[PDB]
C-alpha cells in the first residue's frame, strides 16, 4: 500500500506541472525504492548501500570511504554493473551487449 502511495505522490509532483510521464517509469522507480523491504531512499544513505558491487557504488558520494571497506572485507565484484565495465574499458552487458555472437562453422558452408 505504501508503494501505491509513494507512487501516487510522485505522480502528483509531475502532474501539478501539467506534464505527463508514462506509468512504467515512475512505477519502476517507485518499485526500486520498495522491493528491498520498505522505503529505501534514493540517496547515499539507502540504495548505494545495497549488495551491489563496490566499484559501482564507488562512483557516487562515498568513493574511497567505500573502497577502503571493500578490501578490508575482501569483497568480490561481479562486473555486471554498467559502471563496473565502464571503469574497466569493456563492453557493458547493455542492449547491444546483452548477448554474444558467433560464427556457426556449420551454416558457414551451406552458404556457397
Amino acid at each position: 500500500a505504501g508503494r501505491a502511495a509513494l507512487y501516487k505522490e510522485v505522480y502528483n509532483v509531475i502532474a501539478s506541472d501539467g506534464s505527463y510521464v508514462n506509468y512504467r517509469h515512475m512505477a519502476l522507480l517507485v518499485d526500486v525504492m520498495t522491493t528491498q523491504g520498505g522505503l529505501t531512499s534514493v540517496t547515499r544513505h539507502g540504495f548505494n548501500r545495497s549488495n551491489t558491487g563496490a566499484l559501482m557504488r564507488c562512483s557516487f558520494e562515498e568513493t574511497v570511504e567505500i573502497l577502503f571497506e571493500a578490501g578490508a572485507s575482501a569483497e568480490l565484484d561481479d562486473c555486471r554493473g554498467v559502471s563496473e565495465n565502464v571503469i574497466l574499458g569493456q563492453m557493458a552487458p547493455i542492449g547491444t551487449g546483452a548477448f554474444d555472437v558467433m560464427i556457426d562453422e556449420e551454416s558457414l558452408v551451406k552458404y556457397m
Binding site: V21, H25, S59, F68, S83
Partner: protein
C-alpha cells in the same frame, strides 16, 4: 592500443577481488629497497640514486631502462617499491575498524567475547552478511567489558561451564587523534589511562582465531584484521607521482613524491633513536610523527585539524583526495573522459537540411577523420582521397600500414606517391553522410545525443534542422554543441541503427512523438491553411516543385 605485440593471451576482467596487502606480499612484489629520501643527484650528478624513485623502478629522461624491462616510459607501467617502516602504524582510514575490533575482542589472549554460549550471539552468527554480522556482533560485545571465563550453558544457571581463560578486565576505548586510549576500571576505585601502542594492538590481532576472523567481517586469505596495521609500505612508482621538467637544470617533483620523502625521513630519524641515546619516551614523540605522515599521505582531510600544510600553506594532495568524487579519477577520469575525434562550435538553424542531417563546417570535416580500411571495393576512391591531400576537402590525412607505422600525409616525401595495400587503413576526412553523434549538454535525455548525417558545408557553424531543436533543447542565441565521430564499422552501426534522429521521433518518456514543427513553419503552416487562403498557378507550381517527392502531378 599500447603497441608492440605480446605473446600473452588477452582476456577481460571478470571479477575484482578486494583485499589488503600483507607486509610479506608487499615485500615480495617490490623491486626497490627505497632507503634514501633524496631524489637523484648522485652528488649533483644527474641520474637517480638507488634511493627513491628508480632504485630499480620505472623511469624518466626518455631512457629505456625499467629493470631492463625496457620498453621505456610508454608501456612500462609502474613497478611498486616498498619501504620497511620502523614501527607499526595505523591505516588512516581503518582506524575506525581497528578500534571497533578491539572493542570486540580482549587483549592478552585475543579471542571473541561472546561464544555460541550466549544466545543473543547465536542469532548474530547466522546472519550471512559481513557488513551485518560485524555490525551486530559489535553492538553486542562493545558493552561487556569482562572476558568471561565461565558462563551458564543451555541448562541450569546454577551450573557454570568453562571455555577460554583470562578475565583481565576489558578497557572501554575512545579516539584521540590517531591513537587509541582506554580506561581500565578498578574496584575495591578510580581509572587507569594508558595509550594502546600499535605494537600491542597489532599483536592482539595476530593471535585472533581463524574462525574468529571470519565470524567478524573478514577473510583468511585476502584481508586478515592484522593487516589493517601497516608494517611495510608500498611505494607507488613515478607514473603515479610523475615529475614535470622545465628542460633540465631545474626540478618538478610531485606532491606524493614529497610525503614519501617525509615519511622516509621521519622513519629513519626514529630508527636512529632505538639504536642510540634512547630516552625511552622521548621517542614516542617522534613515532607519532611517522604515524602522522604515513597517515596524511593517504588521507589529508581529517577531524584532528592539522592539515599537514606543505611550505607555502598549500594543503597537500593526499591519495584519497585524488579519487574523491567529481573532478577526480573515479568520477572524472573513468566514468567520464576527455576524448579524441570530437569538435564543438556554435549552432544555427537551417530550414534547408533534412531532419536527420547536421551541417558540418569544412574547417572541421578536414580536421576530424575516419579510419577506413583499404578494400578492393574502395581502393580506387581511397587512393584518390590520399592523393588529394589533407588540405583539399574530400581528401585524407593519414595512411597506416600493417607494419604499425603512421605515414603523415602532409609531410612524408612520398605523399603524392603511395599505392595502397588491401588491409591498410586510410584515416580520411569526414564526408557527406558519415553518421555522427551530435549533442547539447546538459544531457538528460536519450535524445540529448542523437545521430545525424554529416553534410559538409561552408561557414563556421553546426547547422541543425529546426524540428530536432526541442529535443536537444536548443536556441541559437549563441548556443554551442558537441560532435563525436565514430571509429569502427560497427560503431557507426550502433549510431545509425539506434541513435539516428528519425528513430527518436516518438519518445517512450511520454509515449508521444517528441519533435514537431515550430516558428515560421508552424505559424506559417496555419495561415497557408485557412479557407480564406488561395494560391494561383504560377506559384502552386513552384510549391509543387519544392516537395522533392512530388509525383509531378499538378
Amino acid at each position: 592500443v599500447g603497441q608492440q605485440y605480446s605473446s600473452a593471451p588477452l582476456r577481460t576482467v571478470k571479477e575484482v577481488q578486494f583485499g589488503l596487502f600483507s607486509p610479506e606480499e608487499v615485500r615480495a612484489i617490490s623491486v626497490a629497497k627505497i632507503r634514501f629520501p633524496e631524489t637523484m643527484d648522485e652528488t649533483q650528478t644527474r641520474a637517480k640514486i638507488g634511493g627513491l624513485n628508480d632504485p630499480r623502478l620505472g623511469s624518466i629522461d626518455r631512457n629505456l631502462k625499467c629493470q631492463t624491462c625496457q620498453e621505456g616510459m610508454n608501456e612500462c607501467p609502474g613497478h611498486f617499491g616498498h619501504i620497511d617502516l620502523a614501527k607499526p602504524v595505523f591505516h588512516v582510514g581503518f582506524i575506525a575498524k581497528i578500534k571497533k575490533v578491539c572493542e570486540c575482542v580482549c587483549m592478552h589472549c585475543g579471542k571473541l567475547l561472546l561464544d555460541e554460549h550466549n544466545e543473543l550471539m547465536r542469532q548474530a552468527l547466522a546472519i550471512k552478511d559481513s557488513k551485518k554480522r560485524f555490525a551486530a556482533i559489535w553492538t553486542l560485545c562493545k558493552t561487556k567489558m569482562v572476558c568471561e571465563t565461565d558462563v551458564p550453558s543451555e541448562d541450569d544457571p546454577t551450573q557454570l561451564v568453562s571455555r577460554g581463560g583470562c578475565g583481565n578486565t576489558q578497557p572501554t576505548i575512545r579516539k584521540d587523534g590517531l591513537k587509541l586510549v582506554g580506561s581500565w576500571k578498578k574496584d575495591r576505585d578510580e581509572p587507569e589511562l594508558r595509550v594502546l601502542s600499535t605494537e600491542e594492538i597489532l599483536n592482539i590481532f595476530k593471535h585472533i582465531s581463524v574462525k574468529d576472523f571470519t565470524s567478524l567481517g573478514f577473510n583468511e586469505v585476502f584481508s586478515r584484521p592484522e593487516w589493517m596495521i601497516l608494517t611495510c609500505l608500498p611505494v607507488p612508482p613515478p607514473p603515479v607521482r610523475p615529475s614535470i621538467s622545465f628542460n633540465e637544470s631545474q626540478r618538478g617533483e610531485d606532491d606524493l613524491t614529497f610525503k614519501l620523502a617525509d615519511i622516509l625521513k621521519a622513519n629513519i630519524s626514529l630508527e636512529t633513536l632505538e639504536h642510540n641515546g634512547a630516552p625511552h619516551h622521548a621517542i614516542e614523540e617522534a613515532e607519532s610523527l611517522l604515524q602522522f605522515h604515513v597517515a596524511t599521505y593517504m588521507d589529508n582531510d581529517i577531524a584532528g585539524q592539522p592539515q599537514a600544510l606543505q611550505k607555502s600553506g598549500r594543503p597537500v594532495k593526499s591519495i584519497r583526495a585524488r579519487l574523491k568524487g567529481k573532478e577526480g579519477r573515479i568520477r572524472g577520469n573513468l566514468m567520464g573522459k576527455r576524448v579524441d575525434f570530437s569538435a564543438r562550435t556554435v549552432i544555427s538553424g537551417d530550414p534547408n537540411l533534412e531532419l536527420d542531417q547536421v551541417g558540418v563546417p569544412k574547417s572541421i570535416a578536414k580536421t576530424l577523420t575516419y579510419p577506413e580500411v583499404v578494400t578492393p571495393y574502395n581502393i580506387d576512391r581511397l587512393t584518390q582521397l590520399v592523393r588529394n591531400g589533407p588540405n583539399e576537402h574530400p581528401g585524407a590525412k593519414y595512411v597506416i600500414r600493417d607494419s604499425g607505422d603512421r605515414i603523415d600525409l602532409r609531410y612524408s616525401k612520398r605523399a603524392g606517391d603511395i599505392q595502397l595495400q588491401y588491409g591498410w587503413k586510410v584515416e580520411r576526412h569526414i564526408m557527406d553522410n558519415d553518421p555522427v553523434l551530435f549533442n547539447r549538454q546538459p544531457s538528460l535525455h536519450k535524445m540529448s545525443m542523437m545521430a545525424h548525417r554529416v553534410k559538409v558545408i561552408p561557414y563556421s557553424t553546426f547547422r541543425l534542422n529546426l524540428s530536432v531543436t526541442s529535443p536537444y533543447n536548443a536556441d541559437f542565441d549563441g548556443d554551442e554543441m558537441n560532435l563525436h565521430v565514430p571509429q569502427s564499422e560497427e560503431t557507426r552501426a550502433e549510431l545509425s541503427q539506434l541513435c539516428a534522429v528519425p528513430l527518436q521521433i516518438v519518445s517512450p518518456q511520454s509515449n508521444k512523438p517528441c519533435m514537431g514543427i515550430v516558428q515560421d513553419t508552424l505559424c506559417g503552416i496555419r495561415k497557408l491553411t485557412l479557407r480564406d487562403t488561395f494560391i494561383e498557378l504560377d506559384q502552386v507550381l513552384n510549391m509543387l516543385y519544392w516537395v522533392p517527392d512530388w509525383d509531378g502531378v499538378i
